[PDB]
Amino acid sequence: KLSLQDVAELIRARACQRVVVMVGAGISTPSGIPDFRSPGSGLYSNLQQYDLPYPEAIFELPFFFHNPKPFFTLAKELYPGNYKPNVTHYFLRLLHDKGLLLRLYTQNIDGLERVSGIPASKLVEAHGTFASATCTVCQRPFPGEDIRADVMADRVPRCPVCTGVVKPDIVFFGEPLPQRFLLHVVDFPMADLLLILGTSLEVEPFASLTEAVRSSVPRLLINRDLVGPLAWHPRSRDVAQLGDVVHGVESLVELLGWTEEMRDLVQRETGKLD
C-alpha cells in the first residue's frame, strides 16, 4: 500500500517519468466554471428557459436537433476568453516542462489545458473541442472562429453552403470519441504512473482507461470520492488522496518541492492572459 509521499518520492527521483494523466470537470471548477445541473450561476438561469428534461440532454443529439439553443448557450459560456486555468492545470504544465508528462487525457471541453501552455501534441481532448466545428448536414468543417460571432450573438450558426446547423466538434453521447483517443493503445502500455484528477469516471470509454496501465504501474487518484474501476477493481499500488482536488494537488506539489516554482509559473502565465 503506497502513500502520497511515496508517489512524490518516485517523481522526485525520476523513477516515474512517463506519466499519463486523466482529468475531468473537477479540475476546472476552481476556475469558476459552473456546474449547469445546480442553481446559482447565470448559466443555469440562462438554461432554465429551455425545457430540459435532464441536464445531460444538452449533450444528446436527438435533443440537440430538437432545440440546439441550450447547447449554444453553454458554448457561448465555455468559448475561450471567459475562464483561465487554475493551479491544477499549471501543475500539469510544470509536469510537462520538467519532461515527465507522456500524455494528458481530458474529458473537459473548456480548452484550459491548451491555455495553460501544454502543447497539443501532449494533449488528447477525448470529449471534443470548440476549436473546430462541422456542419451536421454536409460535413463541411469550420474553424471555431467562423461561428464565434453567431454564438456570441445567441444565433444558432448555419452552414453558408446548405444552411444546416453547424455543430462544434464536441463529442455527444452516442458518438465515438475523436480519432486521437486511439493514442491510448500506445500511451498506456508505456506509462509508469497514472494520475486521475477531478473525475468520477461515469463516462465510457474514457473511464475504462484506468485499467489499461500495466499491473505494476501505480494509480494516484486525487478526487473527493473513490470512484469507477478503482473501487471495484483496486490494485496493490493504488493511491487515493480523497478530498478537495486543489488541496490534494497543492499537497502533492509541496511534497515534490515545487511550490515556489509553481507559483512563479502561475503569476507569469495568468498575467500574460490579460
Binding site: 491510448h184 461515469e202 463516462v203 465510457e204 470509454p205
Partner: peptide
C-alpha cells in the same frame, strides 16, 4: 483498442 466504442454513461452508483 479492444471494443472501445461510443460515448456512453455508466452505472453502479448511488
Amino acid at each position: 483498442g479492444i471494443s472501445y466504442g461510443r460515448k456512453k454513461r455508466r452505472q453502479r452508483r448511488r
